[PDB]
Amino acid sequence: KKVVVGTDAAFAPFEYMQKGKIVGFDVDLLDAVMKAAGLDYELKNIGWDPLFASLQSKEVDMGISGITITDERKQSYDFSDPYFEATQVILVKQGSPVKNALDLKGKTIGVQNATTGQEAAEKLFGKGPHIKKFETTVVAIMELLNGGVDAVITDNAVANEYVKNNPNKKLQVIEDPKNFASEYYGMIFPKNSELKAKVDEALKNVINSGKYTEIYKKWFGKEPKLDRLKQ
Numbered sequence: 729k730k731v732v733v734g735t736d737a738a739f740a741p742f743e744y745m746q747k748g749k750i751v752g753f754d755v756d757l758l759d760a761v762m763k764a765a766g767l768d769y770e771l772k773n774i775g776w777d778p779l780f781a782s783l784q785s786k787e788v789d790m791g792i793s794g795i796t797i798t799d800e801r802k803q804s805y806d807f808s809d810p811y812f813e814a815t816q817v818i819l820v821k822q823g824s825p826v827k828n829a830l831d832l833k834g835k836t837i838g839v840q841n842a843t844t845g846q847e848a849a850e851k852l853f854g855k856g857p858h859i860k861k862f863e864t865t866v867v868a869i870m871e872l873l874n875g876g877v878d879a880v881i882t883d884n885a886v887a888n889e890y891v892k893n894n895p896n897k898k899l900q901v902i903e904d905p906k907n908f909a910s911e912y913y914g915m916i917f918p919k920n921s922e923l924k925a926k927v928d929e930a931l932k933n934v935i936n937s938g939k940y941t942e943i944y945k946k947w948f949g950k951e952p953k954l955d956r957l958k959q
């Protein structure tokens with residue numbers, strides 16, 4: 729019996745489809761972690777909202793989908809030790825007047841459904857019509873390109889990856905460290921999972937052996953500050 733791992737492979741550089749195969753930082757880290765934990769696994773591309781549903785039903789044993797550790801998600805799920813630090817940013821067209829998150833007032837914001845980016849947008853301007861929720865971040869960014877939304881709030885490394893990969897779209901990343909707090913990714917599990925402890929120990933092995941850093945350098949071209957993982 730293999731471990732069923734779910735991911736939403738529409739979140740580059742962490743997980744995405746390349747020539748019909750699921751690739752990314754989370755994909756490479758998962759492979760490293762699971763082999764260090766001695767667990768045969770299957771990686772499923774399932775979708776963002778199906779994934780969380782599947783984890784609650786326990787049909788999926790494990791998740792790695794650039795998922796931010798939050799106390800709101802700790803209600804139903806368990807998390808591994810953090811393996812990445814992120815923050816929400818604001819993605820816009822280069823000609824945007826947006827300088828900070830407060831400039832987004834009265835404007836339409838495209839977020840992926842049930843994410844920390846949605847939460848951040850709803851924290852500032854409350855729940856309402858000009859917060860447009862999409863199943864993938866890919867589609868949210870697509871509503872930005874065509875003018876359907878004025879701004880996108882998503883994770884920083886994803887936004888930076890899209891700007892880097894797509895210069896002809898002429899998008900810019902607006903950072904607001906005053907409004908957006910530090911976030912940490914964790915591998916997710918159904919409540920009281922027996923895999924969590926094995927994954928935590930395997931992650932340490934992966935970090936200690938220098939395996940994590942090689943994967944980090946591959947996707948981000950620089951040395952990680954590993955002290956971000958002991959916060």
Ligand SMILES: N[C@@H](Cc1c[nH]c[nH+]1)C(=O)O
Pocket residue numbers: 739776793794795796840842843844845865883
């Ligand atoms: N890290 C954010 C955004 C995200 C990760 N994967 C898809 N969206 C979250 O877990 O809510």
